[PDB]
Enzyme design. Structure first.
Site, PDB file in Angstrom:
ATOM      1  N   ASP A  35       0.845  -1.194   0.000  1.00  0.00           N
ATOM      2  CA  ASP A  35       0.000   0.000   0.000  1.00  0.00           C
ATOM      3  C   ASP A  35       0.884   1.249   0.000  1.00  0.00           C
ATOM      4  O   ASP A  35       1.384   1.660   1.055  1.00  0.00           O
ATOM      5  CB  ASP A  35      -0.903  -0.012   1.229  1.00  0.00           C
ATOM      6  CG  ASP A  35      -1.799   1.208   1.317  1.00  0.00           C
ATOM      7  OD1 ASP A  35      -1.922   1.917   0.303  1.00  0.00           O
ATOM      8  OD2 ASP A  35      -2.387   1.414   2.413  1.00  0.00           O
ATOM      9  N   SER A 199      -0.714  15.604 -11.999  1.00  0.00           N
ATOM     10  CA  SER A 199      -0.965  15.258 -13.383  1.00  0.00           C
ATOM     11  C   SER A 199      -1.212  16.520 -14.201  1.00  0.00           C
ATOM     12  O   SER A 199      -1.733  17.520 -13.704  1.00  0.00           O
ATOM     13  CB  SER A 199      -2.166  14.309 -13.458  1.00  0.00           C
ATOM     14  OG  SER A 199      -2.553  14.075 -14.793  1.00  0.00           O
TER      15      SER A 199
END
EC number: 3.4.23.22
Length: 330
Positions: A35, A199
């Site tokens: 994770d 992004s």
């Protein structure tokens, strides 16, 4: 040193991925959920409340000659999905894919919430975010990657998750045969303890690319792709009959639909998520309403590039002095 381990979907939907991890002496092998959105290595154990164990493999520290109680240390964690676990702490030897760390903090669960009990395939989590998020008190502990870093050939790990198929976590090297083209690297902020990056925009299907900054985290421990409501609405508007359902808890779509792809930007590069990766199947057994793999992050407080996005790429978690993330197509 290096390590290399295969990671395998837990079910037919790729809801999560499990990777075998050797703990203790002699080795006890548990299947852990790696994770990159958390920083605790915790396991079901001989200390876990018996009614909360339902098929998981447990770590028994009393059977490990290298286990040592970390005296006074406790841990308690709550995840974004509402699940939680807590317990005490041992140090022990932990190996992943041939890479061994001695003195790793292994957090032994005394209590786990129902969603963990109900998932017999996940024996614990191995956190790979920054150690500043580790919950052990009163002495915070380091992640497996943090402990291994100095010994690694290169201070990196890579995630290569498969779509409906096994994939690979590598530590200490970049497998140049595992991706196509070049790796585009992008800046990371560690201020929240996550692999947080920006992004450069998105496209829906064959549509034009929209240049827009989307701050979010690369999180292998989250199944879906959580993005701003504007972005998610633009995606689902291209699917006839798709709608946001408050009763189901997100966007659903007719199971008869063919979904468009979704592209996200990494600098000037582009990662394409095929439409099929966005299908999470019937909302309930036999339903013709299917659950979408792109969902709104509104109310979550952060955008999350979870498995839906990451499994479309070869992803480099670069833990150099200034960390960065790399993405390649594959």
């Amino acid at each position: 040193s290096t390590g290399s381990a295969t990671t395998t979907p837990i079910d037919s939907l790729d809801d999560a991925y499990i990777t075998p991890v050797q703990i203790g002496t002699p080795a006890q092998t548990l299947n852990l959920d790696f994770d990159t959105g958390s920083s605790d290595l915790w396991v079901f154990s001989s200390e876990t409340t018996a009614s909360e164990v339902d098929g998981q493999t447990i770590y028994t520290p009393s059977k490990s000659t290298t286990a040592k109680l970390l005296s006074g240390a406790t841990w308690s964690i709550s995840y974004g999905d509402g699940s939680s676990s807590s317990g005490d702490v041992y140090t022990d030897t932990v190996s992943v894919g041939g890479l061994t760390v001695t003195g790793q903090a292994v957090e032994s669960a005394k209590k786990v919430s129902s969603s963990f009990t109900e998932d017999s395939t996940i024996d614990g989590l191995l956190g790979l975010a920054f150690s500043t998020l580790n919950t052990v008190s009163p002495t915070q502990q380091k992640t497996f990657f943090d402990n291994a870093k100095a010994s690694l050939d290169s201070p990196v790990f890579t995630a290569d998750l498969g779509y409906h198929a096994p994939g690979t976590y590598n530590f200490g090297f970049i497998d140049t045969t595992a991706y196509t083209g070049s790796i585009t690297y992008t800046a990371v902020s560690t201020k929240q303890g996550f692999w947080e990056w920006t992004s450069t925009g998105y496209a829906v299907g064959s549509g034009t690319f929209k240049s827009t900054s989307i701050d979010g985290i690369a999180d292998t421990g989250t199944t879906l792709l959580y993005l701003p409501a504007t972005v998610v609405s633009a995606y689902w508007a291209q699917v006839s009959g798709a709608k946001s359902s408050s009763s189901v808890g997100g966007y659903v779509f007719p199971c008869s639909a063919t979904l468009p792809s979704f592209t996200f930007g990494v600098g000037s590069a582009r990662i394409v998520i095929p439409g099929d990766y966005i299908d999470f199947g019937p909302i309930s057994t036999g339903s013709s309403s299917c659950f979408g793999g792109i969902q709104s992050s509104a109310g979550i407080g952060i955008n999350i590039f979870g498995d839906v996005a990451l499994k479309a790429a070869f992803v480099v978690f670069n833990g150099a002095t200034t960390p960065t993330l790399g993405f390649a197509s594959k």
